[PDB]
Write an enzyme that holds these catalytic residues in place. Structure first.
Site, PDB file in Angstrom:
ATOM      1  N   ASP B  21      12.801  -0.199 -17.539  1.00  0.00           N
ATOM      2  CA  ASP B  21      12.874   1.131 -16.932  1.00  0.00           C
ATOM      3  C   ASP B  21      12.623   2.277 -17.919  1.00  0.00           C
ATOM      4  OD1 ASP B  21      13.363   1.458 -14.024  1.00  0.00           O
ATOM      5  OD2 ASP B  21      14.810   2.992 -14.637  1.00  0.00           O
ATOM      6  N   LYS B  24       6.951   2.856 -19.028  1.00  0.00           N
ATOM      7  CA  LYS B  24       5.802   2.247 -19.692  1.00  0.00           C
ATOM      8  C   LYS B  24       4.582   2.342 -18.773  1.00  0.00           C
ATOM      9  CE  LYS B  24       8.344  -1.338 -19.814  1.00  0.00           C
ATOM     10  NZ  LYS B  24       9.472  -0.439 -19.448  1.00  0.00           N
ATOM     11  N   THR B  25       4.794   2.019 -17.499  1.00  0.00           N
ATOM     12  CA  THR B  25       3.735   2.071 -16.497  1.00  0.00           C
ATOM     13  C   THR B  25       3.385   3.537 -16.232  1.00  0.00           C
ATOM     14  OG1 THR B  25       4.701   0.099 -15.428  1.00  0.00           O
ATOM     15  CG2 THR B  25       3.022   1.307 -14.196  1.00  0.00           C
ATOM     16  N   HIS B  84      11.581  -5.389 -17.862  1.00  0.00           N
ATOM     17  CA  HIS B  84      12.724  -6.075 -17.269  1.00  0.00           C
ATOM     18  C   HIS B  84      12.988  -7.408 -17.974  1.00  0.00           C
ATOM     19  CE1 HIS B  84      14.900  -7.193 -13.220  1.00  0.00           C
ATOM     20  NE2 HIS B  84      15.731  -7.021 -14.233  1.00  0.00           N
TER      21      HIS B  84
HETATM   22  N1  LIG Z   1      12.621  12.643 -18.566  1.00  0.00           N
HETATM   23  C1  LIG Z   1      11.628  11.855 -18.062  1.00  0.00           C
HETATM   24  N2  LIG Z   1      11.947  10.840 -17.233  1.00  0.00           N
HETATM   25  C2  LIG Z   1      10.841  10.185 -16.797  1.00  0.00           C
HETATM   26  C3  LIG Z   1       9.483  10.382 -17.132  1.00  0.00           C
HETATM   27  N3  LIG Z   1       8.669   9.496 -16.512  1.00  0.00           N
HETATM   28  C4  LIG Z   1       9.520   8.734 -15.821  1.00  0.00           C
HETATM   29  N4  LIG Z   1      10.862   9.090 -15.969  1.00  0.00           N
HETATM   30  C5  LIG Z   1      11.638   8.071 -15.077  1.00  0.00           C
HETATM   31  O1  LIG Z   1      11.622   6.812 -15.815  1.00  0.00           O
HETATM   32  C6  LIG Z   1      11.962   5.673 -14.945  1.00  0.00           C
HETATM   33  C7  LIG Z   1      11.038   4.421 -15.041  1.00  0.00           C
HETATM   34  O2  LIG Z   1       9.929   4.477 -14.119  1.00  0.00           O
HETATM   35  P1  LIG Z   1       9.021   3.125 -14.068  1.00  0.00           P
HETATM   36  O3  LIG Z   1       7.738   3.868 -13.778  1.00  0.00           O
HETATM   37  O4  LIG Z   1       9.618   2.108 -13.143  1.00  0.00           O
HETATM   38  O5  LIG Z   1       8.895   2.227 -15.298  1.00  0.00           O
HETATM   39  P2  LIG Z   1       8.405   0.836 -15.719  1.00  0.00           P
HETATM   40  O6  LIG Z   1       7.762   1.131 -17.049  1.00  0.00           O
HETATM   41  O7  LIG Z   1       7.633   0.278 -14.551  1.00  0.00           O
HETATM   42  C8  LIG Z   1       9.699  -0.127 -15.832  1.00  0.00           C
HETATM   43  P3  LIG Z   1       9.932  -1.723 -15.619  1.00  0.00           P
HETATM   44  O8  LIG Z   1      10.055  -2.040 -17.080  1.00  0.00           O
HETATM   45  O9  LIG Z   1      11.196  -2.024 -14.858  1.00  0.00           O
HETATM   46  O10 LIG Z   1       8.803  -2.299 -14.807  1.00  0.00           O
HETATM   47  C9  LIG Z   1      12.007   6.331 -13.530  1.00  0.00           C
HETATM   48  O11 LIG Z   1      13.355   6.870 -13.515  1.00  0.00           O
HETATM   49  C10 LIG Z   1      11.022   7.560 -13.724  1.00  0.00           C
HETATM   50  O12 LIG Z   1      11.257   8.549 -12.711  1.00  0.00           O
HETATM   51  C11 LIG Z   1       9.186  11.496 -18.055  1.00  0.00           C
HETATM   52  O13 LIG Z   1       8.084  11.852 -18.444  1.00  0.00           O
HETATM   53  N5  LIG Z   1      10.341  12.146 -18.464  1.00  0.00           N
END
Ligand SMILES: Nc1nc2c(ncn2[C@@H]2O[C@H](COP(=O)(O)OP(=O)(O)CP(=O)(O)O)[C@@H](O)[C@H]2O)c(=O)[nH]1
EC number: 3.6.5.3
Lengths: 82, 392, 205, 85, 61
Positions: B21, B24-25, B84
């Site tokens: 979380d 990264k994506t 994850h």
């Molecule tokens: N402060 C801040 N928070 C952010 C930013 N971009 C995302 N967040 C939050 O970070 C979190 C991760 O989003 P996600 O896109 O699922 O990530 P992931 O890289 O797919 C994660 P996973 O490793 O579970 O697959 C969400 O809460 C998103 O709203 C940013 O630029 N700034």
RNA sequence: AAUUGAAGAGUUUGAUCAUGGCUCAGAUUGAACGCUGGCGGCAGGCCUAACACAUGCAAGUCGAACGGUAACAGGAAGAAGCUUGCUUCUUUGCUGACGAGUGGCGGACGGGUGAGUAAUGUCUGGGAAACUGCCUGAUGGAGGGGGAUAACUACUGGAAACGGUAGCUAAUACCGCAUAACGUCGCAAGACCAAAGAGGGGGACCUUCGGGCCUCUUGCCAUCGGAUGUGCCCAGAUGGGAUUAGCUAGUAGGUGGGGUAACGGCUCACCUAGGCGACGAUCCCUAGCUGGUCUGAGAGGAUGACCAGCCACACUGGAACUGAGACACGGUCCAGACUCCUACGGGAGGCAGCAGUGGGGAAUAUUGCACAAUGGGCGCAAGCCUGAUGCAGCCAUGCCGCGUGUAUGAAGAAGGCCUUCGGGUUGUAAAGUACUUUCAGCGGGGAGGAAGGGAGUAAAGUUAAUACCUUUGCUCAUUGACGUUACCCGCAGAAGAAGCACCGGCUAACUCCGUGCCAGCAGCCGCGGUAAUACGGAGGGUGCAAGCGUUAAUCGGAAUUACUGGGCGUAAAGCGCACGCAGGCGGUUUGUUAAGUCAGAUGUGAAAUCCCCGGGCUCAACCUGGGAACUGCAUCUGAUACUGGCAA
RNA sequence: GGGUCGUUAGCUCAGUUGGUAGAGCAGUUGACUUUUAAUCAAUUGGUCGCAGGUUCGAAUCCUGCACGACCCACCA
């Protein structure tokens, strides 16, 4: 339209063309009236390899059947005198 | 079908790794639009990245997603791996298609267990240099606390022998980046610059006998059995019959296809990430986890020796030593074969910290080669990391 | 396609000196002939009807190394012919190229005969042949090609042929190993005893 | 369908439209005579028969009527008018 | 309800196998045979005679 | 020269002979599976889901029909940089050519599947109320006029598809007027009806300087032929069930109107009240049919995948148009289902065409090359398209051929194996040794399939013409998909290439050790309870061969559906018996007739396939010329003893 | 590849609130008896589907896996 053409018989790699009288609207080896003699282009230098039933040729062409250029050149090959 | 691809620049294997979380994506979305402004076009949206709807029900990339971007100098096949802990096995598989990635960790968090977990396995799969891009810097404008973050990551890399001195630890935000703000969008441009610079172009031999670890079999309704894999070495044309090597007993298969991300291609080359069609093969004959390779030049065995290290509880590993009967899974680039732990005369148990040596007995025969590294995961997290020594 | 197994074992099976191991040393004499089929040659066969028919069928095939299905092909080919099938089939079997080459004397055994045809050696009507199943056409000639002629073997190959019965339906130059084919082999000459009578009964059912 | 022969479709369209109008006018000159026979106006009926004479043949000559049907219309219709002529 | 050939087997409740026709005239109703050496009912272990039947491979050596 | 062709055994019973079931030895396949496996040739390769589908391709062509030219390389008036003709470039349909469009032709051909169809289909042979593009022959014509419209401009609805409105214009597009005969209506007199022009070359003549004009090739229009294709009818034959015996009411027919190319309840109107059926109707089940294939001594039975003819269908059901021909695979209209795109208002699509995929199933392939050759459509031709076709690939699926070697070789060894542990067997087998080297593998030579077409030139026809054009020679360059071709030569070394079922009898070939009505085996009889010729394995041996067995289906043996050729006193089987209709059978004489019958001649019975005799691939498989047969059926003429009709 | 529930003597299968592996027939072994059968008794069976983590105590609870089954995308 009736015509005189080859029938493409013989095995693979070895064609045995049957000069036959048939309608142009038929298949290559399909339904034909009568095979008017035969022709073998690869009948290795020997006794036979070409036989045109000249009798029915003049008769059928003298009816409406068109000879094919191959056989037309084969008539030039069977030469009415040579 | 559509678009035959051109051999303009080398096919570099990059991607993203990091703690669960940590956007990264999210960063993945911004980097592509950068070359949609600095190069012809390669833009990819966050939602377009997430291929599965179940990933749209959790936000986590359950199924590893690849995106595409290329700089004015070199092309970059991207591999967005999930952070994850319950999706690290899928991460190691895609790790067999990278040589250097982007450590995307939330700046507000810092080096944590899952950040530390994805980094160690990197060495054991073949990933030497990873430029670290810490996202979410629009919420933590505090330099002082973050100076320790870039400091301890260089120290964290030193813990796993990665010379963190040459690799830059970069801070940036993906929020304003993809959303139109000129400032943080240009910060992703910083990542566009470092990518071509630091990591050079290692010489992947296109003359060496064909090798392609089966990444993931795809259901291309219309062509049949299409499978992607990293042609780590060699080349392949549309017509040469290669074999399916791995778990099942090997046999040939005609390569009647060569395609790159839905774009046509005549022949393959080393270090390439492409999909190839296999003539007359069932979907379940060849399977996700084996290896595609040239016939008559490779033979598979089951056993090998190795110098193994077990994760201590200080770094995030298990708690106690494992006894005879324990069977974790050894990962050779893309294979999750379970392996019984054969401890020799003397060492009856291995503590979480021993760098001891022992003989290995897996459950399935894989093309053996002395030197192939493997990650060991069981119980939710990593229980080891080693290297193949000698096959019997 | 060839039996190519122990050539004297087939002998003892029938006990008959099928000339398989004719070679250089004229007579066998080194296998305790007639009473050594296999491990239990002590049991004198009750030999049923099917046996004498089969042991006759095999016996003929063993003399020339003819395969069953191929032999049956020769069979119907003899049936569609006119006259006595029992005589038509034997001429067909005798008319083999390697058979005639053997009869000419170009080899102590029929083993070399078939082998000789295969290795671009035998030349009939100036045309090299490799097919051993070649039915020899009436009134021809047979010879050995130069670049494969008398390779230390061919001359000695005709050594035992001097003490053979030397058939009538053929002759040879023998100066170049150039045989000459004549009329078809007649029954009274061939077989000598092998009952073709049994053979026709066998396949008839 | 996906074919340059879609023209043969609209051409048959352009054909059947013009082909309909002529076939339409032809049958009305026919029904006019039949209407006359219903009464027995041998003067006008004959006149209408002569009137449709040049238009009945023209259609068969163009390729509309199969000219065997045309011959029938000049025969059976005559058989009608002469029966009351 | 076909007979499972081979001196010993390894099938259990699911085993998707092949069935060749063959009565037994030893057990009533049974007029079929399980194909030894097929889809799931693999080759009978330790077989040297008649390995074309029972689907047993040629010896290792 | 053209069918010379037929086998049984085991099993009821204490044992025997019969009756009568069962089972196998053989062969075949559109076969799969298992084990195994070297190559080549020639065939075959979704029989289950007539279930559904992404992508590429499967039928387009003619500028010698026309207005045009948006493109492409040139011509021409000009221009510009600047080496003032070196080049840059705007004009321009003047050319070679050619999108979009108008028109002509084909697209109804070839290809695929076998769902449906039990007879409106097919096969067989006769018949008459039929139509017929392109091709071919022959008789005349081919005169003169008219109004729009696509393209293209312009405004413009709609997401798109697909359009709309107002101007512009041609043609071998369309429509009148004329002119018509051996054409159509009519008994007749009379009446009425057709069209199209372009292309090449050119002397005089002549230029409103577009051309009129001479001439040739060709096409168009009308009539009679022929050919071919197709429509149509009749009889016979063409599966099962009687536990379907009755069916039908445009149903059976006449006349009259309408309709079709054609006659017809094809369709209406009146009237008649019949017609179909026990030599099997209707209804239901199932199903493509035939030449042929498999088998069989023959007769038959089963089948009919492929090659070929015919028929039916095209997502489902129905309808109609253009057209010579469809009531249409890559056509239209509509409704429905199933999918796709959607700007949510509305549209778009049919792999049962070749590949290919998902699903199904025991079960079967390349998203290859090329129109080189053959055929086909268009065209003057050159050329263009062709997933027909010609090949290559995948697979032992079948048929056929070859090879993995041969010769010497007693020490009668090693070891396995049996033992009366004497000996024997494995076993000339191997080794050692003398030679050979096919096919594969590599390196070099190399046919044939190719006829033409193109240009130049020559001569012969034609004509005002040495021109244009047609026929026939010469010459040049050539035209190859297969193709690392067929085939040949060389190099290397026996090196890379043998297994599979079985061994009690049937039915080819034996013992030991071990397991003990356990594991097990099996086509039938049947075997296994401490010494198994059958179980497991070992040794030996047999059958067969790149195959061997298993499963399955077909037939034969089965004379256990019997026509050829069986049974019924008791083995299954004389109705309990009699009268009696249809049907079947019928004494003896003469005479006639000639349906049955027999003989002869002819037409047909397609070809391929089966049979005989030859030819060519190294042989064969296979290809293949000629013949034979195609057992049938129709017609005419004869014999007429026999059956039958008819007379006494 | 994902996340949700199962797997225990020869067999059907047990083991609740985490306290320490067995029940009914049996496979088989002796007896009755025409062989028996039944049944009475005798012998026995798991490295709790593989192990490990938290465990004093884990067949119970925490996951990763071989063998099964459902929905989720699996669309070079
Ligand atoms: N402060 C801040 N928070 C952010 C930013 N971009 C995302 N967040 C939050 O970070 C979190 C991760 O989003 P996600 O896109 O699922 O990530 P992931 O890289 O797919 C994660 P996973 O490793 O579970 O697959 C969400 O809460 C998103 O709203 C940013 O630029 N700034």
């Amino acid at each position: 339209m009736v015509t005189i053409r080859l029938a493409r018989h013989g095995a693979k790699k070895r064609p045995f063309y049957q000069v036959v009288v048939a309608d142009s609207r038929n298949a290559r080896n399909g339904r034909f009236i009568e095979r008017v003699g035969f022709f073998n282009p690869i009948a290795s230098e020997k006794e036979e390899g070409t036989r045109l039933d000249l009798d029915r040729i003049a008769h059928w062409v003298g009816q409406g059947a068109t000879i094919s250029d191959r056989v037309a050149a084969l008539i030039k090959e069977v030469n009415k005198a040579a | 079908s559509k678009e035959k691809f051109e051999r303009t620049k080398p096919h570099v294997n990059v991607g993203t790794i990091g703690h669960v979380d940590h956007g990264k994506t999210t960063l993945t979305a911004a980097i592509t639009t950068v070359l949609a402004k600095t190069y012809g076009g390669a833009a990819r949206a966050f939602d377009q990245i997430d291929n599965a709807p179940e990933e749209k029900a959790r936000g986590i990339t359950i199924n590893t997603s690849h995106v595409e971007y290329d700089t004015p100098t070199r092309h970059y096949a991207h591999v967005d791996c999930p952070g994850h802990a319950d999706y690290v096995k899928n991460m190691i598989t895609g790790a067999a298609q990278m040589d250097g990635a982007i450590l995307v960790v939330a700046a507000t968090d810092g080096p944590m267990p899952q950040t530390r977990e994805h980094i160690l396995l990197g060495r054991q799969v073949g990933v030497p240099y990873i430029i670290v891009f810490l996202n979410k810097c629009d919420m933590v404008d505090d330099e002082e606390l973050l100076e320790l973050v870039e400091m301890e990551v260089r120290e964290l890399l030193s813990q796993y022998d990665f010379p963190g001195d040459d690799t830059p630890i970069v801070r940036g935000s993906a929020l304003k980046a993809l959303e139109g703000d000129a400032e943080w969008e240009a910060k992703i441009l910083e990542l566009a610059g470092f990518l071509d610079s630091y990591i050079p172009e290692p010489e992947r031999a296109i003359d060496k006998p064909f090798l392609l670890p089966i990444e993931d079999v795809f259901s291309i309704s219309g062509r049949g059995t299409v499978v992607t894999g990293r042609v780590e070495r060699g080349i392949i044309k549309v017509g040469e019959e290669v074999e399916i090597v791995g778990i099942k007993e090997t046999q040939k298969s005609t390569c009647t296809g060569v395609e790159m991300f839905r774009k046509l291609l005549d022949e393959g080359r080393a270090g390439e990430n492409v999909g190839v069609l296999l003539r007359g093969i069932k979907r379940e004959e060849i399977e996700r986890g084996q290896v595609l390779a040239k016939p008559g030049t490779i033979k598979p065995h089951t056993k090998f020796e190795s110098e193994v290290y077990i994760l201590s509880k200080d770094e995030g590993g298990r708690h106690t030593p494992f006894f005879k009967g324990y069977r974790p899974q050894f990962y050779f680039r893309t294979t999750d074969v379970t392996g019984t732990i054969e401890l020799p005369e003397g060492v009856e148990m291995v503590m979480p910290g021993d760098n001891i040596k022992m003989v290995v007995t897996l459950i399935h025969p894989i093309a053996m080669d002395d030197g192939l590294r493997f990650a060991i995961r069981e119980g939710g997290r990593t229980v080891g990391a080693g290297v193949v020594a000698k096959v019997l | 396609a060839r039996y190519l197994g122990p050539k004297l074992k087939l002998s003892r099976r029938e006990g008959t000196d099928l000339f398989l191991k004719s070679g250089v040393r004229a007579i066998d004499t080194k296998c305790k002939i007639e009473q050594a089929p296999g491990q239990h040659g002590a049991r004198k066969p009750r030999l049923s009807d099917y046996g004498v028919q089969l042991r006759e069928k095999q016996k003929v095939r063993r003399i020339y190394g003819v395969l069953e299905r191929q032999f049956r092909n020769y069979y119907k080919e003899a049936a569609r012919l006119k006259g006595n099938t029992g005589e038509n089939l034997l001429a067909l079997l005798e008319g083999r190229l390697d058979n005639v080459v053997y009869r000419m004397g170009f080899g102590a055994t029929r083993a070399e005969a078939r082998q000789l045809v295969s290795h671009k050696a035998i030349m009939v009507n100036g045309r090299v042949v490799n097919i051993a199943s070649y039915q020899v056409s009436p009134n021809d000639v047979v010879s050995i090609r130069e670049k494969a002629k008398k390779q230390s073997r061919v001359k000695a190959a005709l050594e035992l042929a001097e003490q053979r019965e030397k058939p009538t339906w053929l002759e040879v130059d023998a100066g170049k190993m150039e045989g000459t084919f004549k009329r078809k082999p007649e029954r009274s000459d061939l077989s000598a005893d092998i009952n073709e009578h049994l053979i026709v009964e066998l396949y008839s059912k | 369908n996906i074919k340059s022969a879609k023209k043969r479709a609209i051409q048959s369209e352009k054909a059947r439209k013009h082909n309909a109008s002529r076939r339409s006018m032809m049958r009305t000159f026919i029904k006019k005579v039949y209407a006359a026979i219903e009464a027995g106006d041998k003067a006008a009926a004959q006149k209408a028969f002569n009137e449709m004479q040049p238009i009945v043949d023209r259609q068969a000559a163009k390729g509309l009527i199969h000219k065997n049907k045309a011959a029938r219309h000049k025969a059976n219709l005559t058989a009608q008018i002469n029966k009351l002529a | 309800t076909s007979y499972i050939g081979g001196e010993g087997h390894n099938l259990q409740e699911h085993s998707v196998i092949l069935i060749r026709g063959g009565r037994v005239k030893d057990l009533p109703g049974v007029r079929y045979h399980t194909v030894r050496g097929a889809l799931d009912c693999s080759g009978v272990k330790d077989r040297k005679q008649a390995r074309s039947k029972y689907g047993v491979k040629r010896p290792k050596a």
